[PDB]
Amino acid sequence: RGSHMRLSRFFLPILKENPKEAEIVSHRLMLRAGMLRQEAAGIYAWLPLGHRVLKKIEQIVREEQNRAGAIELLMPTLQLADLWRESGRYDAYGPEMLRIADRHKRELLYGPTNEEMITEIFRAYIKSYKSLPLNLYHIQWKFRDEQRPRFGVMRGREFLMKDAYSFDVDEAGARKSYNKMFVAYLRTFARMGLKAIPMRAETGPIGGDLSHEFIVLAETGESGVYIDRDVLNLPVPDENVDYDGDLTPIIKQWTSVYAATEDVHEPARYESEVPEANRLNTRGIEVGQIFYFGTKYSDSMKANVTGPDGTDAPIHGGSYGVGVSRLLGAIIEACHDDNGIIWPEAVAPFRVTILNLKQGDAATDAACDQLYRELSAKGVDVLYDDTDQRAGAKFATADLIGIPWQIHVGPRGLAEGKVELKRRSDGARENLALADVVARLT
Amino acid sequence: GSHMRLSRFFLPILKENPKEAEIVSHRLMLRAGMLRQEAAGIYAWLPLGHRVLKKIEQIVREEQNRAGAIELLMPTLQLADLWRESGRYDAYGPEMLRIADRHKRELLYGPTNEEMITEIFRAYIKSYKSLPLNLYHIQWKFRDEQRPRFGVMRGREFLMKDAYSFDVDEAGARKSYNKMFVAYLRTFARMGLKAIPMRAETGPIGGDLSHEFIVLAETGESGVYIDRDVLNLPVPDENVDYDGDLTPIIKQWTSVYAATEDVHEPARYESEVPEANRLNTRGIEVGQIFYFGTKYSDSMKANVTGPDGTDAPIHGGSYGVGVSRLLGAIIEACHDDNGIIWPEAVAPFRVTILNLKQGDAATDAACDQLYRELSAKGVDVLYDDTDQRAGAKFATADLIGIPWQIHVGPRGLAEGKVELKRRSDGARENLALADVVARLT
Numbered sequence: 034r035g036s037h038m039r040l041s042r043f044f045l046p047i048l049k050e051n052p053k054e055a056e057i058v059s060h061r062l063m064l065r066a067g068m069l070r071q072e073a074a075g076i077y078a079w080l081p082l083g084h085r086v087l088k089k090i091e092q093i094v095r096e097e098q099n100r101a102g103a104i105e106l107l108m109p110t111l112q113l114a115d116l117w118r119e120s121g122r123y124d125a126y127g128p129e130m131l132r133i134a135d136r137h138k139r140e141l142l143y144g145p146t147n148e149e150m151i152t153e154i155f156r157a158y159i160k161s162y163k164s165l166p167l168n169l170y171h172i173q174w175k176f177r178d179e180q181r182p183r184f185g186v187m188r189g190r191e192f193l194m195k196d197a198y199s200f201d202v203d204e205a206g207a208r209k210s211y212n213k214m215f216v217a218y219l220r221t222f223a224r225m226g227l228k229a230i231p232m233r234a235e236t237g238p239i240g241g242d243l244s245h246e247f248i249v250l251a252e253t254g255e256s257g258v259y260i261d262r263d264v265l266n267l268p269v270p271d272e273n274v275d276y277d278g279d280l281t282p283i284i285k286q287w288t289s290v291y292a293a294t295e296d297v298h299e300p301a302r303y304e305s306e307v308p309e310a311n312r313l314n315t316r317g318i319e320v321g322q323i324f325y326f327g328t329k330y331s332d333s334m335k336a337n338v339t340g341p342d343g344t345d346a347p348i349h350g351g352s353y354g355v356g357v358s359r360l361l362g363a364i365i366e367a368c369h370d371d372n373g374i375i376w377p378e379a380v381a382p383f384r385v386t387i388l389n390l391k392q393g394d395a396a397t398d399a400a401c402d403q404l405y406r407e408l409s410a411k412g413v414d415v416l417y418d419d420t421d422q423r424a425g426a427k428f429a430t431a432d433l434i435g436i437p438w439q440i441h442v443g444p445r446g447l448a449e450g451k452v453e454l455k456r457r458s459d460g461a462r463e464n465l466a467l468a469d470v471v472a473r474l475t
Numbered sequence: 476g477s478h479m480r481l482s483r484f485f486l487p488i489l490k491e492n493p494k495e496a497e498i499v500s501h502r503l504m505l506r507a508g509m510l511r512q513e514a515a516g517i518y519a520w521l522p523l524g525h526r527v528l529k530k531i532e533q534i535v536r537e538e539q540n541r542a543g544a545i546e547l548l549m550p551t552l553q554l555a556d557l558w559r560e561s562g563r564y565d566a567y568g569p570e571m572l573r574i575a576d577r578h579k580r581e582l583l584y585g586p587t588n589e590e591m592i593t594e595i596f597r598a599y600i601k602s603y604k605s606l607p608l609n610l611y612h613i614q615w616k617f618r619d620e621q622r623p624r625f626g627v628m629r630g631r632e633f634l635m636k637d638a639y640s641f642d643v644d645e646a647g648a649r650k651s652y653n654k655m656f657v658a659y660l661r662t663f664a665r666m667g668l669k670a671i672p673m674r675a676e677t678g679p680i681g682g683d684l685s686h687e688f689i690v691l692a693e694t695g696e697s698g699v700y701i702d703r704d705v706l707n708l709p710v711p712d713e714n715v716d717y718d719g720d721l722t723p724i725i726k727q728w729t730s731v732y733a734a735t736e737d738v739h740e741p742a743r744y745e746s747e748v749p750e751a752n753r754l755n756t757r758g759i760e761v762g763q764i765f766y767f768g769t770k771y772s773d774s775m776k777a778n779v780t781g782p783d784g785t786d787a788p789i790h791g792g793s794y795g796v797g798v799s800r801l802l803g804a805i806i807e808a809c810h811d812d813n814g815i816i817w818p819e820a821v822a823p824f825r826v827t828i829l830n831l832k833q834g835d836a837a838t839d840a841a842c843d844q845l846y847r848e849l850s851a852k853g854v855d856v857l858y859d860d861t862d863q864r865a866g867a868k869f870a871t872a873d874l875i876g877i878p879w880q881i882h883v884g885p886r887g888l889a890e891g892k893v894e895l896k897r898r899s900d901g902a903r904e905n906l907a908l909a910d911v912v913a914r915l916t
């Protein structure tokens with residue numbers, strides 16, 4: 034039943050020109066488009082339009098974890114360092130890690146991740162191979178005290194993550210739980226119109242020899258990559274994919290082609306198997322990573338189950354992160370033109386925006402009032418720019434904040450019974466009837 | 476229409492009562508698999524409990540937006556400096572989580588957001604034509620409490636809805652207060668709480684006008700002083716005109732004696748209220764409104780240009796709801812010897828299908844069918860398909876507080892009937908299957 038919003042009733046501080054302080058296109062637009070505000074180095078406030086988007090992103094991620102079988106919960110932001118000496122990653126994050134002391138001086142910390150929290154929870158409740166496979170997950174704020182925070186949401190200190198965690202009896206199991214997630218990630222980024230490409234990766238302080246990062250190609254990458262062009266026509270699986278079945282063929286299908294970050298690149302291995310014309314070397318933004326770590330946290334923390342053969346054994350685990358806040362940036366770094374942002378439909382803070390091209394005119398007002406109420410009812414997320422500005426000004430803002438569809442309402446069109454519908458993508462227009470428009474959009 | 480099978484879930488039911496849990500809300504939340512303590516006063520929300528938190532979240536959200544307030548989100552960590560800028564730097568004393576990063580800069584884990592929302596306001600809003608404006612967010616606050624007691628009712632890490640209003644004068648802020656007031660009335664009623672508005676001390680937040688919202692209890696931490704008569708009054712309906720005149724709604728809620736344990740004046744309680752009406756009892760505060768005027772705008776130089784062409788600092792208020800606390804309260808108000816009694820609006824599921832002869836071809840098929848069909852009609856449904864005995868399923872269902880239970884038993888099903896049970900009062904009704912999937916819709 035349709036999100037709805039008049040601009041006179043809102044909080045969108047658009048910015049004149051380009052903030053001295055922003056180095057890349059995504060940070061600039063987000064600042065310009067009234068989405069974001071820095072409150073500290075790498076710590077941001079999410080202003081209402083920006084918050085609106087973050088939610089859309091959240092919900093997609095959620096839906097897809099859920100479709101893959103994972104169960105949501107929420108862990109707290111602060112964790113006892115005690116937990117961390119137990120697995121002994123106490124010093125694994127180093128300077129990058131934020132330690133706190135309470136009013137009783139108790140080694141706490143703002144959690145950069147939750148491998149140890151989730152294991153502690155798993156071991157409290159789950160005792161039998163029957164309970165498995167299990168995949169708990171949350172979408173919660175993390176803090177990494179990055180040395181030099183940059184690029185806005187892209188490299189910040191307080192940031193949002195969906196982190197999930199899988200729990201199987203043995204190796205062959207977890208290799209399945211791994212693939213579920215792998216597929217679910219393929220869909221996730223695709224539903225946000227981004228071709229995120231699976232690439233072999235390095236586990237860092239998270240353990241394991243299996244890990245893929247998902248990387249969207251760019252012209253500003255924290256990481257540089259070497260791929261074969263063809264990895265870009267590969268199909269993604271549709272909503273009816275059976276996660277309960279054998280997923281190997283898709284995984285095969287998504288790895289047989291050369292894909293590598295610069296961390297695990299091998300040129301001698303590469304020129305071997307690409308035609309010289311498909312080679313696209315380029316930079317990319319890591320939007321997520323998936324890890325299999327066997328018994329890292331289960332061994333040294335005693336996360337055992339009694340298995341089908343009678344005896345106790347530590348479970349085989351994995352973990353999987355999606356940069357939910359980083360996705361805002363990455364999406365914009367891959368969906369913009371000189372006029373501003375171009376949101377893909379699923380993530381747009383509104384589907385359509387009504388631009389009243391002569392405010393205060395009884396006719397345009399009545400016509401815009403009605404479209405807005407009709408569009409809301411048909412369950413369409415609608416922004417009505419009822420502010421008191423001129424045609425060019427309204428076109429400028431509408432472009433900038435990258436709403437997918439624009440409806441233009443003005444004197445000479447409406448006198449004849451027609452408005453104009455502008456698709457932001459390519460910028461194509463059609464003159465069409467006021468009756469029509471609402472139907473054609475829904 | 477949200478859907479879950481218990482054999483696919485994560486629901487760690489606890490047998491007895493955990494010895495470390497004094498009040499019932501807490502101990503139930505733990506039995507019901509809703510919660511784990513990770514540190515004193517700090518919690519992980521287990522799947523069942525998160526569902527509920529989210530439904531509470533959403534109820535607050537809806538009424539806030541109906542009241543015309545606008546949602547953003549502020550970060551958890553704030554800079555010390557901001558607090559110097561206002562002189563609340565010392566205001567939370569030892570209840571303040573004070574951090575330093577790898578650069579020796581002083582951060583703090585926000586116990587509230589009055590300054591920051593001012594920092595954001597002063598940055599962008601310059602003209603009185605931009606007001607009234609109310610900005611709210613739902614976000615984890617922190618208070619290092621002396622000794623964290625009573626589970627989610629008095630933790631250190633908690634979830635709050637903190638809303639903040641901005642007006643040009645005295646008059647414009649009353650207007651904005653009044654709205655939230657009405658909005659808080661509708662909010663808690665939507666959880667099936669009688670939350671009673673009472674005059675309150677403003678503490679570190681400041682102000683000479685503040686109403687605290689209290690549900691009556693016995694094992695509650697606040698001492699309260701009203702007269703019984705308040706408990707009848709109407710709760711404004713979903714169709715109020717917020718833009719219009721609310722004062723004669725505030726008048727019938729303010730105007731019988733409502734006072735907490737502070738601000739309580741006794742040679743002033745016996746007089747304004749007659750003999751048989753008086754009642755010294757206790758409660759659980761679940762939200763507080765504050766009007767503070769220029770406390771923060773003065774100090775942080777947040778001015779707008781007014782109607783006459785001059786600058787002046789804005790008049791503010793703030794409005795909070797202890798979202799995570801409400802779980803406690805609701806349970807404390809909604810329970811019996813058998814478990815929780817979730818109000819329809821906040822229940823993690825509306826109905827639970829209990830298969831009373833698990834693995835049996837008939838009852839299975841009949842359950843697989845109801846399940847698929849309620850989900851299809853958008854009814855949040857939980858199928859307890861656990862390989863377990865009848866008594867156990869009844870027990871659990873009761874424990875976790877789902878408002879409706881569907882009992883599918885072999886004899887009952889052998890003739891097209893299934894028993895529907897309302898958890899409130901244990902009303903039952905033997906119904907045909909077609910009958911059941913409707914009805915509940």
Ligand SMILES: Nc1ncnc2c1ncn2[C@@H]1O[C@H](COS(=O)(=O)NC(=O)[C@@H](N)CS)[C@@H](O)[C@H]1O
Nearest residue numbers: 146188189196319320321322352353354356359
């Ligand atoms: N400083 C940061 N700012 C923004 N996003 C980040 C930051 N650090 C990580 N991310 C995002 O979060 C994702 C998960 O990060 S990760 O550390 O590589 N993997 C993990 O933490 C594992 N626990 C998987 S749950 C990253 O792929 C990236 O998209």
Ligand SMILES: Nc1ncnc2c1ncn2[C@@H]1O[C@H](COS(=O)(=O)NC(=O)[C@@H](N)CS)[C@@H](O)[C@H]1O
Nearest residue numbers: 587630633637760761762763793794795797800
């Ligand atoms: N330690 C705590 N644990 C759980 N809930 C709390 C805690 N402290 C306060 N709350 C809830 O949060 C509500 C608002 O808190 S407050 O401190 O009175 N108000 C404020 O902080 C306002 N500045 C925010 S608008 C309280 O009415 C209470 O129900």
